[PDB]
């Protein structure tokens, strides 16, 4: 249920969470799901996608 | 290896990927890993975290 930060992390966008090594973190359930780095074969664009929006080919 | 978009998705930050239903998407390997929505019990802040930066308590 609970995780611990292994390294510092500085936020890079409005939506990520900054934390320090040692912080205790609780994972939450969103409707979008986990986010994956993806490349669109249709458009050539790249970036993070919500896993719950996609299904295997 | 390949996934298909089930719904349209409009990007909300500089780092996510917009796509339309039907696009074919390839998942890529980054050093940060998959991203999870998390709540810091240490600071009370909330947002997405790189999974490879944390370990179970």
CB A52 within 8 A of CB A31: yes
Domain range enclosing B25: 1-57
- Nearest Cβ partner for A25 among B5, B13, B38: B38
CB A17 within 8 A of CB B49: yes
Residue at token pair 């930060």: A5
- Nearest Cβ partner for B39 among A14, A18, A25: A25
Total domains in chain A come to: 1
C-alpha–C-alpha distance, residues B38 and B36, integer Å: 6
The angle formed by the CA atoms of residues A49, A31 and A25, to the nearest 5 degrees, is 85
Provide the pairing of β-strand A24-27 with A2-5.
antiparallel
List the single residue in A with minimal CA-CA distance to B12. A15
């Amino acid at each position: 249920t609970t995780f611990v930060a292994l390294y510092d992390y500085e936020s890079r966008t409005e939506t990520d969470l900054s934390f320090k090594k040692g912080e205790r973190l609780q994972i939450l359930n969103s409707s979008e799901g986990d986010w994956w780095l993806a490349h669109s074969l249709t458009t050539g664009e790249t970036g993070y996608i919500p896993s719950n929006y996609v299904a295997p080919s």
